[model samples]
Target: CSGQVVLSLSTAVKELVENSLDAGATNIDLKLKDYGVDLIEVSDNGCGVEEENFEGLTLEALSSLCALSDVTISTCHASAKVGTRLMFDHNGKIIQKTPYPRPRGTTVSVQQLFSTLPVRHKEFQRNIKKEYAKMVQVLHAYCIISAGIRVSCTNQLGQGKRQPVVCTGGSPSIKENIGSVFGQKQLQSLIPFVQLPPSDSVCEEYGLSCSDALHNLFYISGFISQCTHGVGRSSTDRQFFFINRRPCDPAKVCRLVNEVYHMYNRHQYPFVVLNISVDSECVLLQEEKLLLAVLKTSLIGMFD
Candidate 1:
């Protein structure tokens, strides 16, 4: 609303926070009222940013860090896709996405959100409580699934100490994680298999699928309950999905899960965490800013 700079600034802050969390931080400390302005201070004991990247981590790097805000763009192979503004000045050259300046470390801070925007500032004030709650929920969800990450939230104006939304030391394996979060009842439903080999002809027909289990965004390595008791058509009812190992909202896989369970309950959804890294090549961003994309690639089809 306050021109592209304001948007860029906000995105920059968000990127910094993500960098810290991805570094395996336990505490991300933010200060809203700094120097009488909205300042977001993120400090984590997890992993700090590498010294080599401080220059790139500056306010300008968001242009190149993520090709899209939400999804990867197909045309992003050589450079940012067509119709997208080139983030950096490269003399008409598209630069390849590089690894984070810092490979491992903690404590990244993005400050001055909504800087010089009085109107948006007022809106933020109005939704302070709600925004704070959402922030905690997001932080909690991410921390819980990440193998070594933890999360704590604090409100400087009215808080005594940071609150814990996600705890550390989750069960190491997929089954153990579920059991820890949902208790034995849910864990008991999961089917256990140490390995899933590629599907043969008949097995492939029956939808026997195999995924690159070792390297993926998120997946359950243990067992999935063949049972379909509590699933429902409602989004809220579609429970137990994972993102980067953390249980998350009923998103894409939920639709697949629902489809698979169609004949079973007619009212229930499937419970499974198929560890699949969405291949970046198959995705294409839809919006101008690359906020959303279409999933172009296909997973192995099922038979029975």
Candidate 2:
């Protein structure tokens, strides 16, 4: 499990955030202190754990998941009609359990992050600020992809005031979310494109020559910066791909984006976000081919 999980502060926050998202959370609040060395707290307004599942939730297969010293979970479901808080030690033993008043959703608090592993903690201590920055980047990636979810991240530095890193309006509009997370200038430079590849089989079923399937074999929507606004400090940071609403870093997709950008701007890279929807089987089998086809279609439709 240790080998499987790299004990980094950013990954810890990511795992916690994914859990909230998986639980159907719409609003998520992430707070950290001293680059998450002192504390890390993630609270969400999603479906809370049922009263009966609290014990099983805390103790089931603990070692295989993650490595942390102290953890606490507070959750409630309306069906259960009560909220519960459970504290756990390093060994997954229930230290304390109490009933609390939470209308709905779950709140998970982690303390002394990576405290159980000294070597990992020491590595993290090298440059706390950089780690925090990376964590914010992670949050930004999720926020940009998850349009309807409200995500906010704040950091408190050494008894100082809390500072906001990233905050989104939770608007379903992708442009607004990008503007809030990235910047207004970025929003202005972006070109929105939605492509629905024609399917003959579906078209034949519907008694038409061409149609886009309900279970679309290809649906790609994205916001790519105009070719002129190509000045950036780094080429790698501006590209993002979302496969079925989850953030994924695939070299093939990145390469295709860069290749498309190459035709327009020879010297610089443009900011690109590609949100793709297709059958899982097709993606699993011919992910690269599908990606190439989508990029080709978008370029042709927009540029031509």
Candidate 3:
């Protein structure tokens, strides 16, 4: 969804979704319509846009985002014709070049998404609802578990509520976060903790048991249910990842966690939620898109 050229205006769509989730939105309504021949509409009912930003997007939007400080800025990700260099900052690296812009509103419409391009509309006919379901699921998971944000999806049948695979809302601590996601009863059954040998080396290590609890200061610490392999539908379902306490795509780390557990049980599935606390300064969203890519790569390998 984030990377699709025709569908997503840019990765900012992801940030926009996250922003809505962060704003304590319970339900975010989004619609995708083929507006006219060359235009597409993508809108949401989260916090509305700021009135000041209207001009920014209309004219100075590019310069405005580019002015954002510390973060990296490059137009290389997308084709040159897009002419939009993304903005990122590592601690105020990118300053908002354009200031205090846009009106506040709940709707966001992306015009001319795939303007003048027919090749990108490859799979417009197949199961649009199912494809939409995936994006809604991803947003809903984070919005619900991390930010206490619930999401509602609608098709021809009207609105449908998303059922939390884990819990309704986040718990107080990392362990609690795990409990909420994997059920307290399960955590109670399996002791979950880390086994840190008495050593000066600050290497990261984790341990999870059904019944044990070892309180350890960690960059990210929490009980993660082991992924057990299963035949049919006996496998334990899980998707728990975090970025600065906000639910995010731990694409690689998640797989790594699973890979680590694969050694334990060939047919067993894991269902524990993990708490990851990284150095405040170190866990930089220097380039969010790149950050996600990196996490999907290096962090996933860490588990492997």
Candidate with best lDDT: 2
The list of candidate 1 runs beyond 4 A from truth reads: 1-14, 21-41, 46-56, 59-105, 109-115, 122-137, 151-157, 160-162, 178-226, 231-234, 237-253, 268-272, 278-304
Question: Model 1 misses residue 97 by how many Å?
Answer: 30
Window of ten residues with lowest summed lDDT in model 1? 288-297
- Candidate 1 residue lDDT tens string, 122-199: 665666665554554454344434543433334444334533333434444544444544456755655543332323
Specify the poorest-scoring 10-residue window by lDDT in model 2. Answer: 58-67
Clashes of 2: 0
lDDT of 3 by residue, 15-126 (tens): 5455455444554444433311222122333444333342343232223222221122221111122212323332223333332222232333333233234343334233
Look at candidate 1 and give me any clashing residue pairs.
Answer: 47-105, 47-106, 48-105, 48-106, 50-102, 189-225, 190-225, 191-223, 191-224, 205-303
Clashes of each: 10, 0, 58
Model 3 gets an lDDT of: 0.38
lDDT of 2 by residue, 1-304 (tens): 2344535677778888998898899999898888788888899998888876766774422332224657888888868678888888766667899988886999888877777778777777777878877777777888888878999888898989998788998999877889988889778877887564633442444343322233336567888876564543246666777888777776776776777676767777777777777677765435445446556556645644
Alpha carbon lDDT at 136, candidate 3 = 47
